[PDB]
């Protein structure tokens, strides 16, 4: 049971394109989420009786910046959390969430960054996906660009989403060219590059750091969706992905029995294991999310309805759907986020509203 306990509206009236709970917060500290929209990022604290305590924002000096996405990590030496933000200017900002100071930034991308993700096992490895058709992997410890995943066989239009698998050995990306593409980062070459990125200190050498140019995916398919693929997530070795066709497909590369690590780039088949249908979500840039454990799946649609899927069933097609509505919630939900313990679900909207659902 989720019940709606509170809502609010940010003062800029622009779309909130993203929301992330900090899953690296300390034991005993209150639960905290960031929202991104307009040219800002804002942090809030969850307290009892549905209260959403407004903390502090970071506002970009450029009036024309528009933040699209954010991701949490932490400093690897001090335990302290960090929040990365990015959007239309194609600039990644690493923000100290306590003071909201911009610690540092990365340029390179030829255009808008549509999503950011951190590696599940290495808090320094930041993946950005761009409107310039490419993904980039950054080491935010040594401030190095580890690799660009692109080229003619990479995406031929905007990359909209990507996700590391559980161990962070491979990436799956999706975008406007209707395709989902796989990029392994556990090859000798990539493990070497990450290692070399850690040994790099510009003060102690003469060389620039050389990026990898990865121009070939380890698998590709245009067979799942017939429009823009705007969100992707690993579910073990299986994939969850959506287009703007009111469906989330659960699928895998190759045939039913094929091992994901034995899939070759020539692979021609995919296997569909289920599809979760819903209504009125035919605009693009609409992201579902999952809880920490991947027991559930949340997606908002374009008229303010929420869909939650219970994934704690023995095959993906057996997922149990439930819905959450509120008569005052009628604007489009761009993204959802669960607290780490899944007691709270947050939805953020095109009219700048923030909706809080408690279990």
């Amino acid at each position: 049971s989720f019940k709606c306990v509170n809502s609010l509206k940010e003062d800029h009236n622009q779309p909130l394109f993203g929301v992330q709970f900090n899953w690296h917060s300390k034991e005993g500290d209150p639960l905290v989420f960031a929202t991104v929209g307009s040219n800002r990022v804002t942090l809030y604290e969850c307290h009892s009786q549905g209260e959403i305590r407004l903390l502090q924002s970071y506002v970009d000096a450029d009036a024309d910046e528009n933040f699209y996405t954010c991701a949490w990590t932490y400093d690897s030496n001090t335990s302290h959390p960090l929040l990365a933000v990015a959007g239309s200017r194609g600039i990644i900002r690493i923000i100290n969430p306590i003071t909201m100071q911009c610690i540092k930034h990365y340029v390179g991308h030829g255009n808008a960054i549509n999503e950011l993700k951190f590696h599940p096992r290495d808090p320094n490895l930041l993946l950005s996906v761009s409107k310039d058709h490419a993904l980039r992997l950054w080491n935010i410890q040594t401030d190095t660009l580890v690799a660009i995943f692109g080229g003619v066989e990479g995406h031929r239009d905007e990359v909209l989403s990507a996700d590391y698998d559980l161990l962070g050995e491979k990436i799956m990306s999706c975008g406007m060219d209707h395709s989902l593409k796989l990029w392994r980062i556990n090859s000798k070459r990539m493990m070497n590059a990450i290692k070399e990125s850690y040994d790099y200190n510009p003060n102690k050498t003469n060389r620039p750091f050389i990026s990898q140019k990865i121009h070939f995916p380890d698998f590709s398919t245009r067979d799942i969706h017939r429009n823009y693929v705007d969100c992707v997530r690993w579910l073990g070795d299986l994939i969850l992905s959506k287009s703007c066709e009111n469906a989330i497909v659960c699928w895998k590369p190759g045939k039913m029995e094929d091992d994901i690590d034995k899939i070759k780039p020539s692979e021609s088949n995919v296997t569909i294991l289920g599809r979760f249908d819903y209504s009125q979500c035919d605009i693009w840039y609409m992201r579902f999310s999952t809880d920490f454990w991947q027991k559930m799946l949340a997606l908002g649609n374009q008229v303010g309805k929420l869909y939650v899927w219970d994934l704690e069933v023995e095959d993906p097609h057996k997922a149990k759907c439930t819905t959450l509505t509120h008569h005052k919630c009628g604007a489009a939900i761009r993204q959802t986020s669960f607290s780490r313990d899944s007691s709270i679900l947050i939805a953020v909207c095109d009219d700048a509203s923030i909706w809080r659902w408690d279990r």
């Binding site: 823009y228 035919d282 605009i283 693009w284 840039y285 374009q302 489009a332 095109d350």
Partner: peptide, 5 residues
């Protein structure tokens, strides 16, 4: 495909 309605 539109980004918004």
């Amino acid at each position: 495909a539109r980004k918004s309605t």
